[PDB]
Amino acid sequence: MNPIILIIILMTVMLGTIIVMISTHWLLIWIGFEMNMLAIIPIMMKKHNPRATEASTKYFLTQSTASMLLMMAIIINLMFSGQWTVMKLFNPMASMLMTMALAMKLGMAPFHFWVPEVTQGIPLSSGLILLTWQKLAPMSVLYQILPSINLDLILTLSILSITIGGWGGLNQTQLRKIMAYSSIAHMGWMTAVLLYNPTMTLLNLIIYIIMTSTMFTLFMANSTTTTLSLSHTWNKAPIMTILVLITLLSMGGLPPLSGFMPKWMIIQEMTKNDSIILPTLMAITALLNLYFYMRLTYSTALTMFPSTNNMKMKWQFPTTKRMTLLPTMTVLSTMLLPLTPILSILE
Amino acid sequence: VAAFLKNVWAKEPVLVASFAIAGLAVILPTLSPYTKYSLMINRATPYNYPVPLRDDGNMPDVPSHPQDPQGPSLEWLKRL
Amino acid sequence: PGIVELPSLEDLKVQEVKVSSSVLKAAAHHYGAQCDKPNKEFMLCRWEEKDPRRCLEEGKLVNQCALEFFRQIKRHCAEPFTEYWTCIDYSGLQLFRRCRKEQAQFDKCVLDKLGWVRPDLGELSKVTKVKTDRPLPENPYHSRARPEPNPEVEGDLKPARHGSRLFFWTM
Amino acid sequence: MMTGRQARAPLQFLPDEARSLPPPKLTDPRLAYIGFLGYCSGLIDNAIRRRPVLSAGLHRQFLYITSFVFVGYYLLKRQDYMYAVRDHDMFSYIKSHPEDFPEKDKKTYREVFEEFHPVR
Amino acid sequence: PFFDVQKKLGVDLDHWMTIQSAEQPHRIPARCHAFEKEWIECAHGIGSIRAEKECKIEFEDFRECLLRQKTMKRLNAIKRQRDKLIKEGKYTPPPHHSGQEDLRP
Amino acid sequence: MNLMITLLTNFTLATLLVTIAFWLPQLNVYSEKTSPDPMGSARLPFSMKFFLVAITFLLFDLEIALLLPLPWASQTTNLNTMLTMALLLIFLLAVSLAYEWTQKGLEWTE
Amino acid sequence: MMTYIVFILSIIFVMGFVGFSSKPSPIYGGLGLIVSGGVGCGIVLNFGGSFLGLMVFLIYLGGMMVVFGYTTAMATENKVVLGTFITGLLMEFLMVYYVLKDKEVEIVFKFNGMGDWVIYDTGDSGFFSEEAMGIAALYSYGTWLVIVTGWSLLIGVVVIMEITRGN
Amino acid sequence: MSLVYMNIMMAFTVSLTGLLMYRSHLMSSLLCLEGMMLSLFILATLMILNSHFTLASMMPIILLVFAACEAALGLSLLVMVSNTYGTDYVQNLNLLQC
Ligand SMILES: CCCCCCCCCCCCCCCCCC(=O)OC[C@H](COP(=O)([O-])OC[C@H](O)COP(=O)([O-])OC[C@H](COC(=O)CCCCCCCCCCCCCCCCC)OC(=O)CCCCCCCCCCCCCCCCC)OC(=O)CCCCCCCCCCCCCCCCC
Ligand SMILES: CCCCCCCCCCCCCCCCCC(=O)OC[C@H](COP(=O)(O)OCCN)OC(=O)CCCCCCCCCCCCCCCCC
Ligand SMILES: CCCCCCCCCCCCCCCCCC(=O)OC[C@H](COP(=O)(O)OCCN)OC(=O)CCCCCCCCCCCCCCCCC
Ligand SMILES: C=C(C)[C@H]1Cc2c(ccc3c2O[C@H]2COc4cc(OC)c(OC)cc4[C@@H]2C3=O)O1
């Protein structure tokens, strides 16, 4: 791909997210999602292989169905309110359809069935874009319509996402599918605290984006897409195994790491509202994703591995890959918990 | 500036006429004196009813009849 | 809610201007010239009251002044007006531009026998002022009392009392 | 929660009333922790590119510490501002609604009857 | 997040198509211009929580202008009782509702 | 209403003439034919260039759809803004054509 | 019977979608969507949206379904289909019988059973179609809308030329 | 409310159920998607014309244009699938299950 055209297409992805973030009219929200989808389709087809065409077709169909449901929700809002402001909705049917459509755009359960496939078919940088930047716009629309969001629907979608993201990644050896089920579980964690405190939703979104960006940047720095190729990293660069160690421990929620920061605050904002059972079983399910993270770093990151002779050629060359923001993102994804009251800047 | 222009006029006269007419269409309304009158005629065209004003007592610039000499006129349009 | 009040059928009886649209269109410039004041009192009352039930009598004055407009044509210049609205009436779009000599005969006979000057280009579209005696409607929308706004922020901004107060963070 | 507050003057990182609040000192322990995060970032940057960790790029580690302290100073100003706004709204709401926060009568323990549970 | 760039920069990107009460071409009113204006002027500034309970009557008048469910319900009741009295024969239509009176203006 | 009468009449006359054409020589008992093409039985290969010119038609037809209210838009009172956006839309159609040009998309059906 | 003509077209419109969502083939699916676009366009034209009806004919049918039939020709050379067809048709005709015997129905929303000629307006608009002047307002009031739509179509051209290349 | 709105929404839900669970040609899925767009066009048009809300008359054209561009994008994906398998059968899109 021509780098000028790549810059233009990435600016169009960013422009669609910005149009969803800033616009007051529902048609411009829909336009921003259309622009974002239309622009992100070539980023997935960067390498031009049939897995990326399958992934882009599945992503197209899911985001197009979600966009049609979003426009039907906007249209029922126009029936029952005669106007177009991006605020609370004026019909529970529009509320249900827009919550369903945004759940399809995020990849929340029961519409999760594309997120492990599409992330598998596309490269690591486009999977980084999909799992970080493509979460910003529907969380903004959910942030603005929360007076109309049905609590039972958003909590059903949230805990279904957390259970399916927990019990879907236990079986996984592919790193992109582990990140995709982790995505589904974290979107459940973001949307369950949405009607209680949306600032903690934003906190979970930013800490998730930092940790996911750290993980995909380490994946691009090591060129590892599987568990077993990740095991061959200590004999090439030993620090990269340490960084995927501390960042995967952070994404499951170990104290005293920074990825313990959001969900603890989320539990802290769900017991204020007298919900005890729900964050309890929610973090019970998060213990399962932490547990396969601890298998996936105990059994296959710490204790050192059989290597191959051609690796001794790769000792003679350093990494010339641009590891952009990787030490900053690794420090922020691990050592940020002593600054836990920074969350007030997101209020 | 005239070697490349004669070269493209010998090779691609369709595109020379295209870029020239497009350039004229862009720059020429900023140079025409009649572009003001387009605006003036499109605001002088009464699609709606001229809703009258309640006479408060002091509106000298508002007429009391259509045939009164004060108010907006269209003699600039009748002459042109 | 309530019962919507409607006027009786005797309150709606007025002698109608029972002429065709080409007849109205033929004399329309002299109509807007000569029947200015009751028409504008009616349209002022109609945009201000926002209610046609409050605009019946002024409307009757319109239908009083239009008929006297046509009687004053019928007493003096019935034949050039008839020759003019017939030519207006032939056209499917009712063009003024196809009918200029009949317009000239009608305007000549009207200026001679009635002294009426036809309005120029741009006169009948003027915003004019209307001196009436009826009072200004203090609530034309019948709006109820608006809800009181929330209290605004006042007072100088003090620091947070012992910081964030988040579990053990002392700042 | 407080999104109707910063909607009258939107997209202000630090508003004008934030200048009425005491800014953090440069020896703020939060800001010192942020500078330590910058030093850790410089060490991880020399570690991932196989440089001498404590030796190479002292200007680069200096810009890491400088840039994290620089960003974190304004982040801590906004943090302190938002907790100050939270307490200001809390206190003005309690003052504007005296019926909802009644001064409950303080009873000393000579009137308070607590049930004694013996450990035996 | 709603980063309000339009108010921060003072530009009008899409506030104009947002409501029916806004400035239309050639001053065309919507059918429920007055009702939407009344409900917007009721609910302005008081927040959505106070607006859902303190501007219920304006919003019901505006939603019933939009959908005309009460009006169609009343027309259904009148037309159904009229059809019943036509089938029973206790009512006859007048000449101005049968089309025999050569309309007014 | 008269429009639907006209459309229905044209469809009726077309269906009448097509039915008479398909069934006036079927009165004949001519002969029964067994009759046991440039390609024989090969599958039709996909032509990428035909699809590219169809999508280029679709996208320029959408840009035409944006251009269609211009005779009504020339009647506005905001003529500077209107003229600017009209020249911007025709320029963006020209830029889409220039990108279709220079990236060899208009080749072998140029 | 002529008073319900919009309603009658709407029934055909529903039938038309059950005509092609049963999906015997993309060929006949395209044919059913073209007939459905025609009858829904008749629905649009009967409310006074003449320009939007000609946008259905020029752009949806004449522009886009041509490209669907073209790609169906070039790229794509029962029991489930007929069963889903007759199932949806029985559902729709039972809905028609309900709403015509009751003049009131509730599936998701409450719906009146009289014709939609009642819900119109009794005024006039002078020397213009309001829908025509509202679409003319795209160039005077709709500046940001024109900008984002033109940029989306330019990006659409660029994106199609990227992913159809295969290199 | 209006009775034609029920038929347009029922058409939308018919084409939505036709999109969701069939596992057939990919072109048939794109046809169901554009039937959903068609019903959205008709419904937006009848509402905006019903309420005489003049500035939203340009709204369905926008709803047309973007989505038709969307449709073009989908066809190109189909063509890439049609350049990979020779068919648009969506059960050929099962490489990413493992
Ligand atoms: C006239 C104008 C100029 C005047 C100049 C005057 C000053 C001149 C000297 C300039 C230097 C000033 C240094 C900062 C001020 C003092 C800070 C302090 O002692 O805080 C006490 C602070 C609480 O004690 P305090 O009695 O309440 O306050 C006494 C002071 O008034 C402290 O003030 P405070 O009461 O306002 O404390 C506020 C609050 C007090 O804290 C609280 O209210 C509780 C919340 C604390 C966070 C808890 C997080 C727990 C989960 C995460 C654990 C992470 C793993 C542990 C560390 C592993 C390695 C990174 O702070 C926070 O919440 C912020 C977080 C803690 C930051 C502490 C400063 C760190 C700078 C150096 C970083 C190096 C690593 C330090 C340890 C990192 C972990 C904290 O202690 C701790 O939280 C324990 C950690 C140890 C303190 C850090 C000592 C700084 C110097 C370290 C030198 C050695 C470095 C060795 C190499 C690197 C490590 C491997
Ligand atoms: C309230 C919300 C408001 C908005 C808040 C801000 C949200 C920020 C979200 C960040 C999302 C970043 C997505 C990725 C960057 C975008 C551009 C991109 O993809 O760059 C990667 C680039 C691709 O180059 P290419 O040649 O294609 O690589 C293939 C390898 N041969 O180059 C590479 O592949 C090089 C390898 C390293 C790339 C690392 C990129 C890290 C980017 C994330 C930084 C951390 C997030 C920002 C801070 C937190 C914000 C929430
Ligand atoms: C600023 C004004 C408005 C501009 C925007 C509106 C433009 C309207 C017309 C739209 C045209 C759309 C497509 C344009 C593509 C241009 C690039 C191009 O065609 O380059 C290739 C060509 C060589 O041709 P080739 O590649 O071989 O193609 C097969 C034909 N042999 O190489 C060429 O043909 C060379 C083309 C460049 C030289 C043309 C110079 C014309 C000068 C006319 C007088 C001045 C006009 C003022 C504006 C300046 C224009 C440069
Ligand atoms: C295989 C995976 C995923 C995990 C589980 C696990 C390890 C590594 C080591 C051990 C371990 O199991 C635990 C079980 O119980 C305790 C409890 C302990 O304290 C409560 C304790 O303290 C050090 C140690 C232990 C075991 C221990 O050494 O990796």
Domain extents for chain D? 1-97
- Please check whether residue H81 lies inside any domain of the structure: yes
Bond from prior residue into A256 cis (ω within 30 degrees of 0)? yes
Q: Whose CA is nearest to atom 11 of ligand 2?
A: A133
Tokens of residue C92, six digits: 């499917």
- Please check whether residue H54 lies inside any domain of the structure: yes
* End-to-end CA, chain E: 58
- Please check whether residue H98 lies inside any domain of the structure: no
> Do residues E93 and E69 make contact, with C-beta atoms less than 8 angstroms apart?
no
Q: Where are the beta strands (DSSP E) in chain B?
A: 53-54
Q: How was this structure determined?
A: cryo-EM
- Please check whether residue H24 lies inside any domain of the structure: yes
What distance in Å separates the CA atoms of residue C111 and residue C29, rounded to the nearest whole number? 13
Q: How far is CA C23 from CA C18, C20, C38, C84, F68, in A?
A: 10, 5, 20, 9, 38
Contacts with E10 (C-beta within 8 Å, 6 or more apart), sequence order: none
* End-to-end CA, chain C: 59
User: How many Å separate Cα A336 from the centre of its chain?
Assistant: 19
> Do residues A29 and E10 make contact, with C-beta atoms less than 8 angstroms apart?
no
Residue in chain E nearest D8 by alpha carbon: E7
Contacts with A278 (C-beta within 8 Å, 6 or more apart), sequence order: A155, A159, A192, A270
F94 lines ligand 3 (CB under 6 A): yes
The beta-carbon neighbor of D79 closest among A239, A328, A345 is A345
Q: Is E67 on the interface with H (CB under 8 A)?
A: yes
Pairing of strands B53-54, C129-130: parallel
> Do residues A233 and A156 make contact, with C-beta atoms less than 8 angstroms apart?
no
Q: Collapsing DSSP states into helix, strand and coil, what is residue C169?
A: strand
What distance in Å separates the CA atoms of residue A81 and residue A145, rounded to the nearest whole number? 14
> Do residues A54 and E8 make contact, with C-beta atoms less than 8 angstroms apart?
no
Size of chain E, expressed as the number of residues it contains: 105
CATH number for the domain formed by residue range(s) G4-164:
1.20.120.1200
Name the residue of A248, A291, A296, A298 to mutate for ligand 4: max ligand atoms within 8 A of Cβ: A298
Q: Is D10 on the interface with E (CB under 8 A)?
A: yes
Distance A301 CA to ligand 4 centre (A): 16
Determine which helix (DSSP H) or strand (DSSP E) holds C130, and give its type and residue range: strand C129-130
In 3D space, the residue among H70, C41, A163 whose CA is nearest the CA of residue B51 turns out to be: C41
Q: How far is CA G54 from CA F5, G37, G41, in A?
A: 19, 11, 8
Contacts with H58 (C-beta within 8 Å, 6 or more apart), sequence order: F69, G134, G135, G137, G138, G142, G145
A295 lines ligand 4 (CB under 6 A): yes
Q: How many domains are there within chain H?
A: 1
Show me where the domains of chain F are located.
1-110
Phi, psi angles (nearest 5°) of residue B72: -75, 145
Tokens of residue A254, six digits: 């170990």
Beta bridge pairs of residue A174:
A226
Ligand closest to CA A294: 4
Determine which helix (DSSP H) or strand (DSSP E) holds G112, and give its type and residue range: strand G110-112
Total CB pairs under 8 A between chain B and F = 15
Q: Do H72 and F55 touch (CB under 8 A)?
A: yes
What distance in Å separates the CA atoms of residue A166 and residue A283, rounded to the nearest whole number? 10
Are there at least 3 beta-carbon pairs closer than 8 Å between D and B? Answer: no
Q: Which residues of F touch G133 (CB under 8 A)?
A: 72
The beta-carbon neighbor of H51 closest among E16, E20, E22 is E20
Contacts with C128 (C-beta within 8 Å, 6 or more apart), sequence order: B50, B52, B53, B62, B63, B64, B65, B66, B68, B71, C36, C40
Phi, psi angles (nearest 5°) of residue G106: -140, 110
Distance A335 CA to ligand 1 centre (A): 14
Q: Collapsing DSSP states into helix, strand and coil, what is residue F25?
A: helix
C167 lines ligand 1 (CB under 6 A): no
Determine which helix (DSSP H) or strand (DSSP E) holds G59, and give its type and residue range: none
What distance in Å separates the CA atoms of residue C150 and residue A283, rounded to the nearest whole number? 39
A314 lines ligand 4 (CB under 6 A): no
Q: Residue A311: exposed, middle, or buried by beta-carbon count in 10 A (0-12, 13-18, 19+)? A: exposed
Q: Do H76 and G105 touch (CB under 8 A)?
A: no
How many CB atoms within 10 Å of residue B5?
A: 10
Q: Do A82 and H51 touch (CB under 8 A)?
A: yes
User: Angle at which helices H26-51 and G66-75 pack, to 10 degrees?
Assistant: 180
What distance in Å separates the CA atoms of residue D112 and residue D86, rounded to the nearest whole number? 35
What is the residue range of H15's domain?
A: 1-86
Q: Which residues of E touch H1 (CB under 8 A)?
A: 67, 69
Distance B3 CA to ligand 3 centre (A): 16
Q: Whose CA is nearest to atom 46 of ligand 1?
A: A338
Q: Is the dihedral of CA A96, A101, A107, A109 positive or negative?
A: positive
Bond from prior residue into A110 cis (ω within 30 degrees of 0)? yes
B16 lines ligand 3 (CB under 6 A): yes
> Do residues D48 and A331 make contact, with C-beta atoms less than 8 angstroms apart?
no
What distance in Å separates the CA atoms of residue D34 and residue D69, rounded to the nearest whole number? 6
In 3D space, the residue among A254, A64, A287 whose CA is nearest the CA of residue A185 turns out to be: A287
Q: Do E30 and H52 touch (CB under 8 A)?
A: yes
F88 lines ligand 3 (CB under 6 A): no
Size of chain B, expressed as the number of residues it contains: 80
Phi, psi angles (nearest 5°) of residue H25: -50, 145
Distance F101 CA to ligand 3 centre (A): 10
- H neighbour chains, 3+ CB pairs within 8 Å: A, E, F, G
In 3D space, the residue among H47, B49, F49 whose CA is nearest the CA of residue A71 turns out to be: H47
Helical segments of chain G, H only? 5-21, 26-45, 50-55, 66-75, 80-102, 130-136, 143-163
What distance in Å separates the CA atoms of residue D61 and residue D52, rounded to the nearest whole number? 12
Tokens of residue C18, six digits: 């029972």
In 3D space, the residue among A22, A34, A110 whose CA is nearest the CA of residue A71 turns out to be: A34
What distance in Å separates the CA atoms of residue H88 and residue H78, rounded to the nearest whole number? 7
* Dihedral Cα E37, E42, E48, E51, nearest 10 deg: -130
What DSSP state is assigned to residue A226? Answer: B
* Dihedral Cα D106, D109, D115, D119, nearest 10 deg: 130
Tokens of residue A290, six digits: 């932490």
What distance in Å separates the CA atoms of residue G151 and residue A9, rounded to the nearest whole number? 11
In the block, tokens 């006297």 appear at C68
- Which amino acid is present at F77? T
Q: Which residues of A touch H80 (CB under 8 A)?
A: 45, 53, 57
Distance A29 CA to ligand 3 centre (A): 37
How many CB atoms within 10 Å of residue D72?
A: 23
Q: Do H33 and A84 touch (CB under 8 A)?
A: no
> Do residues G42 and G31 make contact, with C-beta atoms less than 8 angstroms apart?
no
What distance in Å separates the CA atoms of residue H98 and residue A317, rounded to the nearest whole number? 33
What distance in Å separates the CA atoms of residue C125 and residue C28, rounded to the nearest whole number? 13
B41 lines ligand 3 (CB under 6 A): no
A315 lines ligand 4 (CB under 6 A): no
Determine which helix (DSSP H) or strand (DSSP E) holds G105, and give its type and residue range: strand G104-106
Q: Where are the beta strands (DSSP E) in chain A?
A: none
> Do residues E45 and C150 make contact, with C-beta atoms less than 8 angstroms apart?
yes
Ligand closest to CA B5: 3
> Do residues H70 and A34 make contact, with C-beta atoms less than 8 angstroms apart?
yes
In 3D space, the residue among A148, A150, A266 whose CA is nearest the CA of residue A198 turns out to be: A266
Q: Which of G127, G139, G155, G164 to mutate to test the interface with F (most CBs of F within 10 A)?
A: G139
- Which amino acid is present at D20? S
Which 3-state string (H, E, C) describes A193-209? Answer: CCCCCHHHHHHHHHHHH
What distance in Å separates the CA atoms of residue H90 and residue H98, rounded to the nearest whole number? 16
Are there at least 3 beta-carbon pairs closer than 8 Å between D and H? Answer: no
How many CB atoms within 10 Å of residue C99?
A: 22
User: Angle at which helices G5-21 and G80-102 pack, to 10 degrees?
Assistant: 160
Residue E71 C-beta-side C-alpha neighbours within 13 Å: 15
Show me where the domains of chain A are located.
1-347
Q: Do B54 and C130 touch (CB under 8 A)?
A: yes
Q: Which residues of C touch A340 (CB under 8 A)?
A: 166, 169
Locate the ligand 1 atom nearest the alpha carbon of residue D26 and give its number: 3
Q: Do G141 and E16 touch (CB under 8 A)?
A: yes
Question: How far G147 CA sits from the closest chain A CA (Å)?
Answer: 11
The beta-carbon neighbor of C122 closest among B64, B68, B74 is B74
Size of chain C, expressed as the number of residues it contains: 171
Beta bridge pairs of residue A226:
A174
Tokens of residue H78, six digits: 């189909």
**Residue C151, Ramachandran bin (φ over 0: left; ψ between -120 and 50: alpha; else beta):** beta
What distance in Å separates the CA atoms of residue F55 and residue G161, rounded to the nearest whole number? 10
Locate the ligand 3 atom nearest the alpha carbon of residue B20 and give its number: 46
What distance in Å separates the CA atoms of residue H24 and residue H20, rounded to the nearest whole number? 11
Q: Residue F55: exposed, middle, or buried by beta-carbon count in 10 A (0-12, 13-18, 19+)? A: buried
In the block, tokens 């940029």 appear at G151
Q: How far is CA A288 from CA A161, B25, F81, H79, in A?
A: 13, 67, 59, 42
Distance D66 CA to ligand 2 centre (A): 23
In the block, tokens 């032509």 appear at F47
Question: How far E26 CA sits from the closest chain C CA (Å)?
Answer: 15
Q: How far is CA A185 from CA A63, A182, A249, A278, in A?
A: 19, 5, 15, 15
**Residue D86, Ramachandran bin (φ over 0: left; ψ between -120 and 50: alpha; else beta):** alpha
Q: Which of C169, C170, C171 to mutate to test the interface with A (most CBs of A within 10 A)?
A: C169
Q: Is B48 on the interface with E (CB under 8 A)?
A: yes
Q: Do C143 and E38 touch (CB under 8 A)?
A: yes
Q: Which residues of H touch A41 (CB under 8 A)?
A: 73, 77
